[PDB]
């Protein structure tokens, strides 16, 4: 039953040999981690390299730097659709092998790694995703899903802030499932000297000091260890000889950089011995490594499982919120909303229409999961259960200020499956979760980013609360919507649009200070859904208004200024710009009509609304300067945004 | 032998303050004023008639919801703060706004707003008298020599950036930091044993201090400064909202609650109104003059030392007067001996003429180990105090960007830092932050494009560089080779209110500066390479684009067809220029294509009349050669051609 040196070599053999190929990659982790990587997927991991997709393998996540040959040599000698020719082209086009691995299309990569520490908070969401649904179905009689969380983690990972962050709440949520392996191979002590196991502890974590990464036995132990906790997760603290098998290059960090070079590589092979050339491996070894009988047995297994869940009372959801399917009465709902809004508007804030809709969507989707991250602006509805206080039925998580971890183990919890996660905290604090943000586009997750207080209009907090840059600079992010409602009407139809999408993440934008409504007729309901449309639609028109969110009702002000002096405008309200450049260019002009000048009214940085400017010309209305702490009403008129100045701008023109 | 009294005199002010502001928070002020109290009127060394002074301990108050002790404190000590501008807390104008502002209100030592980065700029603070100290002091003659401290509350412990600032003050020693923890009244989300975590990073921590009890704060405030070796937090239990019987335990209280307060804690004062003997408690003026008027003294020993005259230079932020001739015979040698460098490598080789001749600059990356921020000079303080100009960070951009910021604060110091441009996501809103303070902070980007190539979309900017541009005051520079690289920190290090950010590529190019005439121009952010009476279209580019410019503008010369190239380095510099110098370099009746391995959505605002086309990304990176990257997103001489082509 013991392990050989050999088995784990062909790990170390793969990472040398594939990265010497490709002139790019590092090799030294690889080596460093091999001995551990062998003990937990050939011995523990339950998982079906036939199907990467079983809903109830174990997850494996590998949170650390450089070392991605690591993974492509699991999947690979597992018996994964990864071949020895995918390896010989490791960082070239369109391969399964990029420098670092990316969720998506390579069989078994779960995540999309390269950004320090975002590893680890993902596999915090993963999980919490196992939690929230083995609470949701399984029953005393049923088990259908249960499940490990693996993590491999490094130095790095420990630095950054986001590992303080997912860990500290980690620790408070008691995932015990979840068990992390520390790559302990340390130049660190310069910038590094953290006590880790003392910081973990501190975080409620069950730590395990001391574990030899180079023996396989111990390695073992250790796992087993963190497999008897009931209520805290792991960190496994793994020494280990980065390099290791090489001669020259075992220890140095600079085995952490460059390939080895042919006589490095012929001297491991000695050292180690090694008796195969490059890319090549025995029979004997891919004999013990593939996991495909297995891997078929296990899941045959659970599958017994899954028919006794057949017909069950929640089988049905079960089904539906895997296939990522909305439920059938959603749509009815959504139009009995919009009616009772038509027939009694109200004036209310955004971040209060969109804690509305909230009743109406959670209502209707169990795999709603909601969140803040606060000391919770309108992401709660009246039937929030907090994870915080309670485990039965918990569909909502405070996650303390927290707002890059939070929105990296929402990127965790979509992957998982079976949950449509969003979370809120004010505009300005998504500079803090921007990459996180980036990574859901890249992912093409369906985050819902929820982004209060969104302009200077939130008064007195100030500059350094108010946002400026930031609606414009997330709408550069490629793959995310940046949807910014007027009112009630058009923040149901972009709520409608943020969880329909397969694909593509969300920005909900709202106000924190109370706006009139504009959405007057069921036409333009539909019209909403296309990110732009009019919301004065005027056949003599001599020029257009074109705004977003809070400025709609100041361009409808001006519009009916002008109806008073006989001279009709358009009004166009374009609620999210990515969307709206998606539609056909008959449209597109029909909205601002290419013929009669437009003026762009937006309080934010308007530099990206020339794009859209008509042949008939205008200008643009925003704010190039950082804001100031007063009233509201005070920062309108400092910064123009006041009927009387937006009319001197169009009278300019008419 | 303090009064209550004399503490619940910031209670009161910020409770007036907040119900006539009908915004804001008295809760925190409440809590924490007992210690506040015992910290300014007993060991606080400060002059309130000269909140610049150099030799001063520095304060920071971290935490959020509780500008009204500070504005209290600053108040009742004697600085030009009033009565009057406390009845104007949060209005147009004012010196009181809701979060404190360094630059106008006086004594105030930074602006902070969003959570964990007033930690991170006290670290900065502490670093900066630890670095100032090793360069001027002798054995003999103390010339910096002070504290700095911090408050902070429970989200600050939360925030990511707290971790990467406190694990690095342990790492580095700073004894004469303290920090101070409004440990009050949810374990739901927050459960961390903070004394342990601190233990952890290296602090000296004193857990259970009693924040009501002026005795134990005293106590536990001369048991920091004992600490030779670490940093020091202090773990003080308050009762927030603490003197009120209805809420003790962020609204302002209504009439009736604050009429209840003032009964309880036996205030027997209006609103506002303060009492002779509290002003005779807390006014330092006196104190405060003599303090000062002493180490005028201290600091006048030392003009007879080799290193006065540099001293009292760089606490000027005045450049040496040797610096442009240095960088001009730079760039005339640049002309004379062109090389085909990647701009990371120009950018050393810049800091190498500048980190010689300017003490004051001090560099430093975020990482395990291509930024290229170090020179042949550089000492790390990781390893060496003696003599240290840089610092290598570890894998903290945040926490980094953050410190940078508290260094450039804290005076006598440029710092600069490097790390991946793709990681400013990390660091964005220390960056801002530099920006709304008018810190000159250079954040030096590396890896600026897909043309870093293998490593992938995780690692290629595409919305960066226009997501930074978008930041109010921050230039943007994207410098083309060694020259443009040249002139760019150059105007980097003489901008006195303006942080700048300095994007670098991994990949070679080629020179494009041909004379002393475009030399002139580069400073203005925007310039022709190619500049042709007859020209048909202008190519704008920036950075690695602009040798791909001047290659499809030479196909076309071969077929009798000219075109004009521009160059603009600085977009934001570019816009400042006179209107009819813009219209020039973009001729406005001929069309242009704006060439930029970036989203490009930016560039319809300076579209000549005569029309033209954006070529950028809109699209995430992919891992691959970069020659194979250039030819998937259409960088190439033939796709470009093919673009003019349909001008011409």
Redesign the interface.
């Known amino acids: 039953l013991s392990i050989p040196r050999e088995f784990s070599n062909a790990i170390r053999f793969l990472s040398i040999d594939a990265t010497l190929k490709?002139k790019?990659?590092h090799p030294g982790m690889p080596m460093g981690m091999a001995d551990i990587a062998t003990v937990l997927w050939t011995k523990f991991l339950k998982h079906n390299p036939n199907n990467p997709h079983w809903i109830n393998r174990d997850r494996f996540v590998l949170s650390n730097g450089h070392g991605s040959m690591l993974l492509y040599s699991l999947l690979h000698l597992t018996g994964y659709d990864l071949s020895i020719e995918d390896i010989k082209n490791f960082?070239?086009?369109?391969?399964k092998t990029?420098?670092?691995p990316?969720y998506g299309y390579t069989p078994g990569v779960e995540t999309?790694?390269?950004?320090?520490?975002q590893g680890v908070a993902n596999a915090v969401g993963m999980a919490l995703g196992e939690k929230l649904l083995s609470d949701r179905y399984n029953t005393p009689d049923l088990k259908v899903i249960d499940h490990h969380t693996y993590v491999f983690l490094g130095?790095?990972?420990l630095?950054?802030?986001?590992?303080?962050?997912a860990c500290?709440?980690a620790?408070?949520l008691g995932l015990n499932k979840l068990v992390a392996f520390w790559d302990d191979n340390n130049?660190?002590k310069?910038?590094?000297?953290?006590?880790?196991p003392?910081?973990f502890?501190?975080?409620?974590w069950h730590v395990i000091e001391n574990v030899d990464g180079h023996d396989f036995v111990a390695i073992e132990k250790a796992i087993n260890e963190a497999h008897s906790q009931q209520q805290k997760p792991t960190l496994i603290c793994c020494k280990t000889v980065i390099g290791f098998g090489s001669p020259e290059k075992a220890g140095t960090?600079s085995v952490?950089?460059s390939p080895l070079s042919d006589q490095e590589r012929a001297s491991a092979a000695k050292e180690l011995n090694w008796d195969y050339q490059a890319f090549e491996i025995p029979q004997d070894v891919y004999k013990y490594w593939d996991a495909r009988e297995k891997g078929q047995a296990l899941e045959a297994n659970w599958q017994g499982q899954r028919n006794l869940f057949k017909d069950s009372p929640k089988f049905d959801e079960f089904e539906r919120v895997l296939s990522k399917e909305l439920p059938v009465g959603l749509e009815s709902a959504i139009n009995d909303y919009i009616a009772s809004q038509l027939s009694n508007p109200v004036k209310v804030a955004t971040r209060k229409a969109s804690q509305m809709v909230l009743e109406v969507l959670c209502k209707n989707m169990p795999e709603m999961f909601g969140g803040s991250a606060d000391?919770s602006n309108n992401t709660n509805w009246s039937g929030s259960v907090?994870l915080?206080?309670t485990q039965e039925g918990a569909n909502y998580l405070?996650?303390?200020?927290?707002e890059?971890?939070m929105a990296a183990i929402m990127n965790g919890l979509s992957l998982y499956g079976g949950i449509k996660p969003y979370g809120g905290t004010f505009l300005?604090?998504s500079?803090?979760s921007?990459?996180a943000i980036?990574?859901s586009?890249?992912m093409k997750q369906p985050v819902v980013h929820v982004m209060s207080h969104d302009s200077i209009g939130l008064?007195?907090?100030?500059?350094?609360?108010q946002p400026?840059?930031h609606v414009?600079?997330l709408?550069?992010?490629?793959?995310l919507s940046v949807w910014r409602p007027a009112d009630t009407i058009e923040t149901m139809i972009a709520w409608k649009e943020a969880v329909k999408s397969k694909d593509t993440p969300s920005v909900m934008v709202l106000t924190r200070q109370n706006l009139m409504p504009v959405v007057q007729t069921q036409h333009q309901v539909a019209n909403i859904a296309r990110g732009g449309y009019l919301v004065k639609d005027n056949p003599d028109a001599k020029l257009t208004i074109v705004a977003t969110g809070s400025e709609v009702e100041l361009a409808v002000k001006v519009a009916n200024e002008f109806e008073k002096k006989g001279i009709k405008l358009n009004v166009a309200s374009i609620p999210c710009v990515e969307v709206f450049a998606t539609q056909a260019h008959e449209y597109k002009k029909t909205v601002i009509k290419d013929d009669i000048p437009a003026v762009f009214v937006e309080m934010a940085?308007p530099?990206?609304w020339?794009?859209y400017?008509p042949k008939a010309g205008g200008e643009v209305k925003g704010i190039?300067?950082?804001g100031?702490?007063?009233?509201a009403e005070?920062?309108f008129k400092?910064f123009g945004f006041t009927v009387e100045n937006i009319s001197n701008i169009v009278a300019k023109y008419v």
Not at 201 to 204: K, N
Not at 398 to 402: A, I, K, L
Not at 459 to 465: A, C, L, M, N, Q
Request: charged fraction near 20%.
């Open positions: 490709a790019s990659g960082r070239q086009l369109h391969s990029p420098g670092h990316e999309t790694t390269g950004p320090l520490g130095d790095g990972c630095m950054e802030g986001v590992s303080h962050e500290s709440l620790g408070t130049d660190t310069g910038w590094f000297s953290d006590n880790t003392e910081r502890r501190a975080y409620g960090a952490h950089g000391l907090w915080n206080n405070s996650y303390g200020v927290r890059f971890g300005v604090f500079d803090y921007r990459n980036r990574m586009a890249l008064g007195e907090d100030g500059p350094t609360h400026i840059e414009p600079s709408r550069l992010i490629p793959n940085q530099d990206m020339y794009k400017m190039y300067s950082f100031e702490s007063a009233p005070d920062l400092r």
